[PDB]
Design a protein around this ligand. Structure first.
Ligand SMILES: CC(=O)N[C@@H]1[C@@H]([C@H](O)[C@H](O)CO)O[C@@](OC[C@H]2O[C@@H](O[C@H]([C@H](O)[C@@H](O)C=O)[C@H](O)CO)[C@H](O)[C@@H](O)[C@H]2O)(C(=O)O)C[C@@H]1O
Ligand SMILES: CC(=O)N[C@@H]1[C@@H]([C@H](O)[C@H](O)CO)O[C@@](OC[C@H]2O[C@@H](O[C@H]([C@H](O)[C@@H](O)C=O)[C@H](O)CO)[C@H](O)[C@@H](O)[C@H]2O)(C(=O)O)C[C@@H]1O
Lengths: 519, 519
C-alpha cells in the first residue's frame, strides 16, 4: 500500500518537550498491519548535536465523516491548554519509540497493530534548550516498512525547518492567554517584546488585562521573567476586570534609548468589547484613555502611566487608541506611533501620532483612509512616512504616504494590490543601507499571507521602497492556524527578529538571516 | 434615586465560599453617589447559626450598548473556571463589607463613589459546610441609604432560598468538566450519582471520557471521593482520547441490591462526535459498544466491564446506547434501562432494554416513537411502563405506554402537550403509595421548564399517573443557565434527591421535601 508524509513548515520551539517534525497518514491499512520501522535522514551540514531526542507516536484513526486527506485527527501539541502547552497531550498520542543519540540516519520502531483504514503516526523532535535560533533541519522520511515490506512514500516533505522560542505560553504566570505582540531593539541590542496579559480568557478589552514585557540581552536565546509594564488594578475602586489596559505599541527613542509603551485603558464598560462600547467624551468614565509608560534603564523598570488623551483625542470620537506593534524614531528625531480612531458615525480611520520633543507632547492631524484600523509606519525615505493599514474592505493592505506627518496623504502604487491580507494586524519596518549586511535600503513586512483565516505567517522584503514584493524575497515561518498578529525588529546587521502569535505559542520569537530573505 | 433588587432562585451551595444572595442595580447614579449602608432582614424561623458570613461587593458599571434591566455585567461566581468555581472572581467583584456573626437584622457599608448611570453591587452568603441541605433562607433588603437619604427599593426579592452541594466542580481531580447525571438510592439508603468525567474539555464522545461515581451514606450531606466506575484507558494501544466511555445510566436491582451501570464505549473515531460518526456493524472498530459494570457492595467497588452489544444491537443501526440517567426495577423484578438507536437512515428512536434474569441477558423489541433520543422510564402502574422522551420536533416531551416491555406502544394523553422542553434530557420516576409520606402513587419529573435554552430546572409531581401536572405541585430550583441534564431518586419516605447540571456546579445535589411539592 501507499504512505503519505507531511513536513509542516511550523517553528520547532527550543523550550518545548515535543514539536511535530513529520505527520504520516497510512490511508488503507488492513487490521493487524504493523509499522515495523521508519527511517529519517538529516542533511549532511545539520547540527544534530543540538537534537536532544526524536520520538515516534501513534494517534489511532480518523472519524468516518472527515475524509482521507488530513494528516492528524486532532492538534497533537496544544498552544491553548493552560495545563500543558510544552508536551504532546498523552490522551491523543502514545509513544512507540525514542532515540536520544541522533545520527544522519535514524530508525524508529513500533509493534502497534493498525486498525482497518486510516492510521496516524507522527515524529516529535526535542531540541537542546540552548539550540541556536539560527539553526535549521533538512529532514526526510526515506523508508517506511509495514509487515516487513518497504511501502511507497508520497507527499511534499522537503521543507527547511526553522527554530523558535515560546516567550509566552497559554497559562504562564496564571494568565489564560497572551495577545498583541510589539518588538523593538534598544540602542544596547536588547530585545523588548510587549503583549496583552489576558488573565480570565482571550477576549479583548474590556477585561482583566495588563501590558506584559519580556526582555532578552542575548538576541532572543533567553528571556527574563515577565515584567508588568502597565496595569490599572482597582483604580477608583472599580474591579480589575473593568480596568483593563491593552493593544500595546512600543518604540525606542533612538536619540536617548528611552523606551515608550502606549496602550488603551478601559475604565468601566461592564464585561463588553471596547470596540463597540467605548463612547464619545474625554474622561476615563466616558471613553478609552490613551496611556503611556517609559523606561530609562533599557526596559528593566517602568514609569507610572501618563494620560495623553486630552492632547490628541477629538471629543466626538467613540474610541482613540495606538495601532498595536511598534512606533519609530525618524532620522530627524521625531517619535511616531501609529493610531486609529472610531468617529461619531462608528467609522474607523488609521493615522499617525508624533512627538517632536522626546515624547513630552503628541499631535494627530488627518486620517490616512476611511474604514482602516491597525496600521504600522516606516520612514521609507528621509521625511517620507509609509502607513500600512488593516482594511475592512478585505483582501489586501492599504498603503499611503505622508511627507507632512499626516496633514495630507497620497495613495502608494502598492495600495490595495501588492500585499494580501485577511483583515489582520501586519508589521512593516525600514532598514537603512548602512545598518544591514546587504548594504541596501530594505522594507520588511510580516502578516498571515492569505485572504482567509490567519496562517502562512511570512516575512517579505522589498528593495524598491515597497513598490514590489518579489516572491523569491519571502520566508514562510508558520503554515498552520494562529491569532496572526506579528512585529518585526532588526536584532543586528545580519538578522531580523519576529515576535508573533503562532500555531505553536501565544508569543513566539524567531530570528531570520537577511541573506535568507534576499539571495 | 430608585434602587432595584433581585433575589435569584439558584441553589446556595454549602461547600462554596460565595453564593449570590442579592443582586442590586442602581440605574441612575450621579458621579460620587455613595451607598453608605444597606440593611438585610432574615425570616423569624431562619437557622442563622448555619450562616458563616455575609459580604457586600461592588462590580462597577454596565456597557453602554447592553441596556438598563440587567442585574450584573458578568457571572460573579463561575461554574466553568477550573482555577476557581467556589469564590467570586476577584477581578469582577471588590469586597466592601463583611459580617461573620449574623443576626436577623444586618447592616453592610461602603465608601465607594459611584459612576454616572448604572452601578452594580451584590450580597454573597457563605454557609457552614455542615449546613442542613433541608435549610431555607427568607432574606429581604429592607433599607438602602445613598448620600444619607433612604432610597426607594423595587424588585421581586421574596424568593425562599434553598441549599445544595456541589458534588463535582469544573477542574475537580484534574477533569475539565463533568456531564450527564444519573442517581439511584440503594436498598441501604446510599445515594449513587454517575457522570461523564470529561478530562480535556466538555464535548461528548469521542474524547478522553470515563464514568465517575460519587457515593453518600448520609442523604447527600457528604460525598465520598470520586470512583471510576468504568474506563478503557489505552485499550488495543489506541489513545485514551479514542477510547472514551460515557452518557451513563445507573439502576439498583431492588431484589438483590446489585447496582448496574450501562455506558457507550467509542473506540477509534478520531476526535469527532459519535452521534454523526458511529457507523453500522458490531465490532469495537466498527460501532459504539454497549458496556456494563456492577457493584455487589453498595457501590464501593465495580466489576470489569462486560460487552452486551451482540445481545441487543441490530447490525444495521449506526449507534445503539442507553438513555442517560437511570433504569428501574419493576414490581415483578424485571430490570429496565431506557435505550435509543440511530437506524440505517440516521433516524433516532427511543425504546427500552430489559432483563428478566438479574441482568444475565438483555432484550430490545420495538421503538416507541420516530425522531426521539434520550428517554427515562417509570412503572406508573403494575406491568405498565411510561417512556418519557426527548423529541427532535421541539417544544414538548413525547410520552408512550407499553404493557409488553416494548413489543407494542400506545400514545399517552400527555404526549406532546403536558410537559414543555427545549430538546434536553429529563428525569421521570414513580413512587409507590406505601413508599412515601403522602401515602399516594406519585410521578416526579425534572427538566429545564422552558421551550428555549436550558434554565428553570424544576421538579414537577403528578397524582394521576402523569395525565396532569398541576402548577401548584412544582418547585423551581435553578432559574439561571446550565447544561440542563437532571436525575431524580427518593432519598427516604419524606424527601426527593435531584442530581443535575446547574448554574452553580457541573454536578449539583439538592434534597426537597415531598410536602413542599404536594401541599
Ligand atoms: C481594541 C480591540 O478590539 N482590539 C483588537 C481587535 C479589533 O477589535 C479590530 O481590529 C477592529 O476591527 O482585533 C482583534 O480582536 C477582535 C476580533 O476578535 C474576534 O475573535 C477572535 C479573538 O480575537 C481571539 O482573541 C479569540 O478569543 C479573532 O477573530 C481571532 O481570529 C471576534 O470575532 C471579534 O470580536 C473581532 O473584532 C483581532 O484579533 O482581530 C484583536 C485586537 O485586540
Ligand atoms: C452521545 C451524545 O451525543 N450525547 C448527548 C448529546 C446527543 O448528541 C443528543 O441528545 C442527540 O441528539 O446531547 C448533548 O449534546 C448534543 C448537543 O450539544 C450542544 O451543546 C451543549 C450545550 O448545552 C448547548 O445546548 C448550549 O446550551 C453542550 O453542553 C456543549 O458542551 C450543541 O450545541 C448541539 O449542537 C448538540 O451537539 C446535549 O447536551 O444535548 C450531550 C449528550 O452527551
Amino acid at each position: 500500500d501507499s504512505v503519505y508524509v507531511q513536513n509542516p513548515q511550523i517553528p520547532i520551539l527550543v523550550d518545548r518537550t515535543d514539536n511535530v517534525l513529520f505527520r504520516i497518514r497510512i490511508p488503507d491499512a488492513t487490521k493487524g498491519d504493523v509499522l515495523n520501522r521508519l527511517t529519517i535522514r538529516f542533511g549532511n551540514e545539520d547540527k544534530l548535536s543540538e537534537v536532544k531526542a526524536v520520538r515516534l507516536f501513534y494517534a489511532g484513526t480518523e472519524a468516518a465523516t472527515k475524509g482521507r486527506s488530513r494528516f492528524a485527527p486532532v492538534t497533537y501539541v496544544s498552544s491553548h491548554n493552560i495545563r500543558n502547552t510544552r508536551s504532546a497531550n498523552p490522551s491523543y498520542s502514545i509513544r512507540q519509540d525514542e532515540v536520544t543519540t541522533v545520527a544522519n540516519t535514524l530508525t524508529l520502531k513500533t509493534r502497534q497493530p493498525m486498525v482497518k483504514g486510516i492510521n496516524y503516526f507522527w515524529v516529535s523532535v526535542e531540541m537542546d534548550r540552548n539550540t541556536s535560533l539560527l539553526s535549521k533541519l533538512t529532514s526526510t522520511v526515506t523508508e517506511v516498512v509495514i509487515n516487513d515490506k518497504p511501502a511507497v512514500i508520497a507527499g511534499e516533505q522537503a521543507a527547511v525547518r526553522r527554530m523558535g522560542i515560546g516567550v509566552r505560553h497559554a497559562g504562564d504566570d496564571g494568565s489564560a492567554s497572551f495577545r498583541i505582540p510589539g518588538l523593538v531593539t534598544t540602542n544596547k541590542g536588547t530585545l523588548l517584546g510587549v503583549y496583552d496579559v489576558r488573565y480570565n480568557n482571550s477576549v479583548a478589552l474590556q477585561e482583566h488585562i495588563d501590558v506584559g514585557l519580556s526582555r532578552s540581552t542575548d538576541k532572543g536565546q533567553t528571556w527574563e521573567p515577565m515584567r508588568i509594564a502597565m496595569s490599572f488594578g482597582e483604580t477608583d475602586g472599580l474591579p480589575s476586570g473593568q480596568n483593563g489596559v491593552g493593544d500595546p505599541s512600543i518604540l525606542v527613542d533612538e536619540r536617548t534609548n528611552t523606551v515608550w509603551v502606549v496602550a488603551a485603558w478601559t475604565h468601566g464598560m461592564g464585561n463588553a468589547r471596547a470596540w463597540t462600547n467605548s463612547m464619545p467624551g474625554m474622561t476615563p468614565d466616558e471613553t478609552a484613555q490613551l496611556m503611556m509608560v517609559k523606561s530609562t534603564d533599557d526596559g528593566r523598570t517602568w514609569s507610572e502611566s501618563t494620560n495623553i488623551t486630552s492632547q490628541v483625542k477629538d471629543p466626538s470620537w467613540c474610541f482613540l487608541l495606538q495601532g498595536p506593534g511598534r512606533g519609530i524614531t525618524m532620522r530627524d528625531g521625531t517619535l511616531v506611533f501609529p493610531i486609529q480612531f472610531i468617529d461619531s458615525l462608528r467609522v474607523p480611520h488609521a493615522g499617525i501620532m508624533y512627538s517632536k520633543d522626546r515624547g513630552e507632547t503628541w499631535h494627530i492631524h488627518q486620517p490616512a483612509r476611511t474604514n482602516t484600523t491597525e496600521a504600522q509606519v516606516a520612514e521609507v525615505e528621509p521625511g517620507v512616512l509609509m502607513l500600512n493599514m488593516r482594511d475592512n474592505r478585505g483582501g489586501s493592505r492599504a498603503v499611503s504616504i505622508t511627507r507632512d506627518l499626516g496633514k495630507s496623504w497620497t495613495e502608494h502604487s502598492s495600495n490595495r494590490s501588492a500585499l494580501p491580507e485577511s483583515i489582520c494586524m501586519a508589521s512593516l519596518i525600514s532598514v537603512k543601507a548602512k545598518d544591514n549586511i546587504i548594504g541596501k535600503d530594505l522594507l520588511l513586512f510580516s502578516n498571515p499571507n492569505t485572504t482567509e483565516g490567519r496562517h502562512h505567517i511570512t516575512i517579505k522584503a522589498s528593495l524598491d521602497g515597497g513598490v514590489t514584493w518579489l516572491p523569491a524575497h519571502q520566508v514562510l515561518l508558520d503554515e498552520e492556524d494562529g491569532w496572526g498578529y506579528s512585529c518585526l525588529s532588526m536584532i543586528d546587521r545580519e538578522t531580523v527578529g519576529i515576535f508573533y502569535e503562532s500555531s505553536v505559542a501565544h508569543m513566539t520569537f524567531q530570528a531570520v538571516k537577511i541573506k535568507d530573505l534576499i539571495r
